[PDB]
């Protein structure tokens, strides 16, 4: 077994670090695959970071892994950082690829290929879970906040890119000029799923409406993925495959 109390503590600490590595990087791989194949195109390009589709889609598809990892970590260890660790791992993988491949392999500027910020939403989700340990309360209030705080959290980053520019007779934002100048051979402009205006777009409501829709759908997706993570935690021994 173990020699003494001290050696047990040291063994537990070593296990803690190794299992933290395993959790963090398996989450990085799986969460990054899910994110980049469910929100990657908006996350890739500043001229894709719009007020309708980016704000709508990103929190909805990104609340998935935080819900499951929370439902496991909080329930089994009272560790209230499942959402934070998921978001940090996604950001780390995204930034590594942006710097070494988007800017390293290809030579797209970082101010063009930067990822979105998600830590505020993750912190809200984690704190709202730890306080008032109710998973239902988390799914309702914390997911609401996660959806709502996405665009305001990223506004300090993308606001300078929205300064209007008179570009060769046409009005363009700085992000628009970035997308125009830095040629993406595989990504023509029409692929861009961004706000284009509708006849039923009343007043200045595009960003708040998208944020509230994303918050509601985030509630729904968090509710689903809490139980998905509950299943994924199963310790069953399927006798034969």
């Amino acid at each position: 077994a173990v020699r003494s109390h001290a050696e047990a503590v040291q063994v537990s600490r070593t296990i803690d670090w190794m299992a933290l590595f395993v959790v963090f990087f398996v989450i990085v791989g799986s969460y990054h695959i899910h994110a980049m194949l469910t929100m990657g195109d908006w996350d890739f390009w500043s001229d894709w970071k719009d007020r309708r589709l980016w704000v709508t889609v990103t929190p909805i598809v990104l609340v998935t892994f935080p819900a499951a990892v929370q439902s496991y970590l909080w329930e089994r260890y009272r560790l209230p950082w499942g959402a934070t660790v998921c978001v940090l791992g996604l950001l780390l993988g995204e930034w590594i690829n942006r710097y070494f491949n988007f800017w390293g392999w290809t030579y797209f500027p970082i101010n063009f290929v930067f990822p979105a910020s998600l830590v505020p939403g993750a912190i809200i989700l984690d704190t709202v879970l730890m306080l008032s340990g109710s998973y239902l309360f988390t799914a309702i209030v914390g997911a609401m906040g996660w959806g709502l705080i996405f665009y305001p959290g990223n506004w300090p980053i993308i606001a300078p890119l929205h300064v209007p520019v008179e570009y060769n007779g046409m009005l363009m934002s700085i992000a628009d000029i970035q997308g125009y100048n830095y040629v993406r051979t595989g990504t023509p402009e029409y692929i861009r799923m961004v706000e284009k205006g509708t006849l039923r777009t009343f007043g200045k409501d595009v960003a708040p409406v998208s944020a509230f829709f994303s918050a509601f759908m985030s509630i729904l997706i968090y509710f689903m993925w809490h139980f998905i993570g509950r299943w994924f935690s199963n310790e069953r021994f399927l006798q034969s495959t």
Partner: protein, 382 residues
Amino acid sequence: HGEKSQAAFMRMRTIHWYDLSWSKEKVKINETVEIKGKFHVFEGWPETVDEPDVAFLNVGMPGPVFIRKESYIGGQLVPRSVRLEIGKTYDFRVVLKARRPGDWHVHTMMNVQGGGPIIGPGKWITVEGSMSEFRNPVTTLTGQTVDLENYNEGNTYFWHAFWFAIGVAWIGYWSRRPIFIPRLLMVDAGRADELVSATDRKVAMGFLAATILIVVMAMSSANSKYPITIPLQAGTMRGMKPLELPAPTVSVKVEDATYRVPGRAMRMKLTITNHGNSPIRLGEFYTASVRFLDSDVYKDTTGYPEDLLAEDGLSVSDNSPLAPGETRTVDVTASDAAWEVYRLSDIIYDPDSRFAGLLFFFDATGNRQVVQIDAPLIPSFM
């Protein structure tokens, strides 16, 4: 570099690029190179490709080795997707600024919303200098000049690092104590209610309140600075002005067209009727980025890519001048190594063995006529 893999018949009948020109073949960093030409949208647009209702004038290149300074269809700038009409001919102009040193194969391409990339002829353009010398200045309507290479980079890095640090601080705060196995045992064996106690709840409340307050304050500060912002400008642009070409005075009827399998030649029999009032002669056959030239009639001087140019690849059985009003039938053979290099011979693998192309007819004075031909392409094996 992305063609030679697409279907031969689809490359033949989507868009015909001609009158292509390049302002320069070798450039310095920050120097501008302009690509001009015309493209014709083929009438027999394949049903598998969506109609070019939403199309984008793109550049085929290995990443931003050039930056697209300007692009025009007709005479007007087209930074967004555009609507093209089948059967119309448009003139285009793309202005590129050199950014990365090296030898780059630059293609002019048209991306269609529901059909994918239509790659035109590509030309090797040499860039010399250093990437560090590249500048992309732009002046905003707020009266400030910024360099797009590094503008907002510091702010982006700062905010991302700040939020990452906040998350790492949260995780480390909870990670100072033992993490996995003792906490699991405490939760399992009896009620836990001991690993989350004040001031842990106070720290979490502080984290939540600080996160919300910092987000609100940062948004307000980013609104006071940059008080003038506009949304992303998007939307397909209609009303592209097509070229008003004169009606051709030459009519050509394709009476069968064959190619040997295997082989590097394509043979077709054409009935050419000369209207107007000048003797014409067949000078060129363009099928898919490949120009088969009759050197005795016409010579290329626009610096067309050599691997796509067949200087004497077009042989006409009787290419004597065609008097006005006279109709004759000739056997036309287009033969060049390009026919196999660019896999135009692989139309035998295609599910639609039909070809399309452009015939260029030249008279004595030098003025030229463009006629379009399309017919089934029948392989011959024995």
